[PDB]
Structure formats: C-alpha cells, structure tokens
C-alpha cells in the first residue's frame, strides 16, 4: 500500500489531546499496517522524527438503529511519539 494511504486520519479525543501534550500523536491507521510502516508513513507525511510507535487494534463495536443491529468497523490506532529536538505535527 502507498505510504499516503497507511495513515487514515488523526484521533481527536480527551485522551489523544492529553497525549499531544507529551508530543505523541494518535492516528487511525490501515488495519493491515505494521508499526514500522506507520513510522515510515508518518515521517514522509510530516517531516518529523519518530521516537516510538505504539499500536493497538480496536474491535468492532455493536450498535443498533431502530430495528437494525450491526457492528462498527474495526480500527487500528497508532500512537506516534516524536523525538525531542524535532518538529511537532500541527493538525
């Protein structure tokens, strides 16, 4: 897959916003991307230097509307920690 397709979007939440204060950035990533790919994708997309990437899988969540019930899509969340002496991401 292309590097520009690995990173889907940022994650903006109370937890991710807090983590930005520590210079780590949460993204939704392609479910098939390993944390090394994410590191490479982040660096090429933002010119930053990445110190560490932590990565989790998010299970699909049960939801219902009216008479219909199903599941939200599975997601893959990558927390990218930038090095010191490095540019930050500005989303």
């Amino acid at each position: 897959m292309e590097l520009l397709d690995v990173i889907k979007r940022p994650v903006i939440t109370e937890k991710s916003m807090l983590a930005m204060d520590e210079k780590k950035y949460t993204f939704e990533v392609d479910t098939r991307a390993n944390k090394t790919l994410v590191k490479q994708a982040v660096e090429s997309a933002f010119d930053v230097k990445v110190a560490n990437v932590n990565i989790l899988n998010v299970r699909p969540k049960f939801k219902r509307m009216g008479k219909y019930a199903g599941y939200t899509k599975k997601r893959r969340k990558a927390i990218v920690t930038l090095t010191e002496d490095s540019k930050e991401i500005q989303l």
Binding site: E2, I12, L91
Partner: protein, 59 residues
C-alpha cells in the same frame, strides 16, 4: 477531466496522481477535524485519481 489527462504524458500523470493522493490525505485530515467545508471534494479527488489510473492502464 479525461480530456486533459490524455493530453499529459505518462510522467506527468504519475506526478499528477501523487499530488492528488496527497490532497486526499489532507482532505481526510481536514475532515477528521472540523476544517473541511467542501466535503464533496473528497469524491472529486478520488475519481480524478481513478480516471488517471484508468487512462494509465489503457495506454
């Protein structure tokens, strides 16, 4: 559109595609935040990339 894509050369179409993929990356990020107004742009860009790849294949 298709007319002007067929005018460009192979290298230009490869480059044109990478410019669109980046714009698509930015649009997704602008959509994730409350910063994207013309949300119809995303489909426009996706189909423009599709049109280029279709043309690339029929050459």
């Amino acid at each position: 559109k298709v007319k002007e894509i067929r005018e460009l050369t192979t290298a230009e179409m490869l480059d044109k595609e990478k410019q669109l993929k980046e714009e698509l990356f930015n649009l997704r990020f602008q959509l994730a935040t409350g910063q994207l107004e013309n949300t119809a742009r995303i489909k426009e860009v996706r189909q423009s990339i599709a049109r280029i790849k279709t043309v690339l294949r029929e050459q």
